[PDB]
């Protein structure tokens, strides 16, 4: 259950094997080595006999590193074919992805193959239920091999696809659907990645990990499909990073969000209010235009009707975004997910977590009782 601290995403293969042997000697009955596409292409999980090698989402991975598309999928297929057993390896993957079918075509054909696609009729899996919500999204899966009940996912399609892919692995061990109750409970536990709303009765808070433009865009689309009323987001850019990434990120954020807050997610020795101006230049505004408007009490909106806010410090802006939210609306924090490190300059501070959001959602009641207005960025302070 415990996980050792590792700097890289994929540790050394020899060290991983030694840790797995030490665990299997005493304190663990099974040693499963799971690595991502980059870890599998590097050789971390490749040098290990994999009983079940399935892909959750097959697409162009490590295209800039490996230099060729479908390289990670081919490496995973080769690693699975190296150590393969009859009717023991699972090929559960979405049928819509062509890389998944290309990887399933390679290797030993005696291995069991199955599809977890919902729209495909050959996969026989389908949600067949309408219970999507920010707290829990239960589906009644009706498949011959898959379990009946499904796991409550925070996302509309991504979490549903993950639950459908995990249902196959859960049913492979046990045909009874009662054994998947623990897996469904663990999936609804709101992990670090694509976290769900808090259990407390308050506005929805979704902590996500979105840094690349495409992932940020797809997460924003999924939130728009899930967000009933408003889409409130707050994020920032890292210093000495891709300079062209900031304007496209700001544009993709402002295109579909009504109100967005721009902060400094990772200063890392880079001057503040500089990359913030870079993000502001995406919507055509300059920090001068905003600052001279801030002396007034108007704050004109965007031409498309949306609104844009910004602040230097991360804590106060995040607390305001958590407080500036409607009942049916949910607040999305795509700046950082499972990460708990904020490097402001040379020093780093570990002051980024969900406990701050919980404290803000608890104290917003006292703020409203005091009479403070948190509708927009210029809080109307009484006298």
């Amino acid at each position: 259950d415990n996980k050792l601290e590792s700097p890289h995403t994929t540790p050394d293969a020899v060290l991983v094997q030694k840790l797995m042997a030490k665990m299997v000697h005493n304190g663990t009955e099974a040693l499963v080595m799971e690595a991502s596409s980059h870890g599998l292409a590097l050789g971390r999980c490749d040098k290990v006999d994999f009983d079940i090698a399935v892909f959750t989402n097959l697409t162009r991975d490590h295209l800039d590193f490996h230099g060729t598309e479908e390289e990670y999928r081919d490496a995973k297929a080769k690693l699975f074919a190296r150590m393969v057993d009859p009717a023991r390896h699972r090929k559960i993957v979405n049928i819509d992805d062509p890389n998944a079918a290309f990887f399933l075509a390679q290797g030993n054909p005696d291995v069991p193959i199955v599809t977890f696609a919902m729209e495909n009729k050959s996969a026989d899996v389908h949600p067949l239920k309408f219970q999507l919500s920010l707290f829990e999204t239960q589906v009644l899966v009706n498949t011959p091999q898959g379990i009946l009940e499904i796991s409550s996912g925070l996302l509309g399609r991504h979490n549903i696809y993950n639950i459908l892919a995990a249902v196959a692995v859960g049913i492979a061990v046990g045909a009874p659907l009662e054994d998947i109750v623990k897996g469904i409970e663990e999936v609804d536990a709101v992990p670090g990645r694509c976290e769900l709303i808090d259990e407390e009765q308050a506005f929805g808070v979704i902590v996500d990990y979105a840094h690349t433009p495409d992932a940020l865009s797809r997460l924003l689309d999924y939130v728009r499909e899930l967000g009933p009323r408003r889409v409130i987001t707050v994020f920032g850019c890292a210093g000495e990073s891709d300079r062209g990434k900031r304007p496209i990120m700001a544009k993709i954020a402002t295109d579909k969000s009504d109100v967005t807050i721009l902060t400094s997610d990772n200063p890392k020795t880079e001057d503040p209010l500089d990359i913030l101006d870079d993000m502001l230049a995406g919507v055509g505004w300059s920090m001068q235009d905003y600052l001279k408007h801030g002396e007034n009490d108007y704050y004109p909106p965007l031409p498309n009707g949306h609104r844009l806010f910004l602040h230097d410090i991360r804590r106060v802006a995040v607390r305001c975004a958590v407080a500036m939210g409607e009942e049916g609306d949910i607040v999305v924090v795509a700046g950082k997910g499972h990460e708990t490190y904020q490097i402001e300059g040379d020093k780093k501070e570990f002051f980024d977590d969900r406990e701050e959001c919980r404290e803000a959602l608890q104290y917003v009641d006292e703020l409203h009782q005091a009479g403070i207005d948190t509708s927009e960025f210029p809080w109307r302070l009484p006298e």
Binding site: D242, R243, G244, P247, I248, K251, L273, D274, L276, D277, D278, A281, G282, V283, G284, S286, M287, Q288, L291
Partner: protein
């Protein structure tokens, strides 16, 4: 008009200092018009991301317009003027202004040297 014309007779190219504003619309040719500091409508909405990439993207220098404490003027335009650039006025506003003055002078002559005048129909006209 007179000046730009003058330069021609001399075969000297307009120097690079003519430059676009934050709104790229501003240029000596288009600025004097009445709508001021307003991006011109091109049908298709201006590609905001495209402008960014052009000035600086990935690597490179852009005059990021963030206000700073040091006293160097933010407009690159101000450079070379000792204190600051001249205040903005349209041809229109200027024209109304110029107009008032000539008139004022005639009124001024009237105020001090004008109560009496050569015309004999003046008493009715003065009022």
């Amino acid at each position: 008009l007179e000046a730009l014309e003058a330069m021609a007779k001399d075969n000297q190219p307009i120097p690079p200092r003519a430059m676009i504003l934050s709104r790229k619309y501003r240029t000596l040719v288009s600025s004097w018009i009445e709508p001021l500091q307003e991006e011109a409508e091109l049908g298709y909405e201006i590609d905001y991301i495209a402008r960014y990439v052009a000035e600086g993207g990935l690597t490179g220098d852009r005059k990021r317009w963030v206000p700073r404490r040091g006293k160097t003027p933010l407009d690159p335009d101000a450079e070379g003027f000792i204190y600051s650039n001249p205040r903005e006025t349209s041809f229109k506003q200027r024209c109304l202004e110029e107009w008032r003055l000539h008139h004022r002078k005639l009124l001024k002559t009237l105020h001090n040297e004008g109560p009496s005048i050569l015309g004999k129909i003046s008493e009715s006209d003065y009022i």
